[PDB]
Symmetry: C2
Subunit: 172 residues, 2 copies
């Protein structure tokens, strides 16, 4: 059997908006889906899931997919955060959804999310000139050309990475 890299990804307790955290675990075992992946831990003081003296946190795998960047047999592991007593940590917002998801499974709710974002180079918007403003809006949206398109290389690389991960992307 094989040795592979597992990227454990989780959400912290930062306010007002929580942030992603991740670290790499090197696993030497026979591959299996999710259930065979070890629970792990981290230091909460560093992630606002303590910033105190009593919170050490537990990482519990809830989702996994291939790591498109690392490639090969490497994987991404999305985790939920638990207290040392295996109850959901207060920052954990997944556990509430899982309860409601189960409660209303008969209705079969389905979601599509259209996720927007903006590129920056430092403090500057990537599509902005240094110290200034670009032309007013109108030609950027669904645009083409160097004058109006910024970051396409990134967007294309990201899209390819998401599909390779098996994520349900319908468009960009």
């Amino acid at each position: 059997h094989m040795t592979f890299k597992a990227e454990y990804i989780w959400i912290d307790g930062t306010e007002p908006t929580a942030k992603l955290r991740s670290k790499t675990k090197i696993i030497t075992a026979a591959p299996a889906g999710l259930d065979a992946l070890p629970v792990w831990g981290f230091d909460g003081s560093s992630t606002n899931q303590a910033e105190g003296s009593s919170s050490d946190c537990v990482l519990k795998p809830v989702f996994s997919c291939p790591d498109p960047i690392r490639g090969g047999e490497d994987i991404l592991v999305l985790c939920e955060v638990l207290d040392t007593d295996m109850t959901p940590h207060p920052s954990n917002t997944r556990a509430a959804l899982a309860e409601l998801s189960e409660r209303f499974a008969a209705q079969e709710p389905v979601f599509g999310i259209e996720q927007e974002y903006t590129f920056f180079k430092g403090t500057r918007p990537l599509g902005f000139p240094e110290g200034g403003f670009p032309a007013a809006q109108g030609g950027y949206y669904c645009g083409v050309g160097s004058d109006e398109i910024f970051g396409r290389d990134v967007v294309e690389a990201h899209l390819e990475n998401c599909l390779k991960a098996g994520l349900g992307i319908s468009g960009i």
Copy 2:
């Protein structure tokens, strides 16, 4: 006895908008107002007052003032342009005003002109960032501060220069 510099300034025949031209004459004579100033000439082909093979032009002083830049006893001499027969050149637009001015001297017409201009550094507006736009208009007009004011050092030098020359400037 003395030598002083005289800057002969005239307007050319460039189209659509005529341009200022100037050269320096070194005069070694006793100073007197306008009437003692020699008429002069130049080569028209170079100034769009020919662009041909037959125009040699005559400079006739109509106004003079101190040269504020050179200082001392030096002066600026504004001229009108004449044909070799001492008649007005076609580019000359002063001569038409002189006829109407005399014709209507009894009504005593008086003028004030509020002259606007914009600073540029190369192809770029002095108040614009390279490749972009500054914030929208509103804070520039009669403004103060580095964020909204561009070229005040030039503006001040020019105003002081106009006053030293004796021009009727009422404000900037």
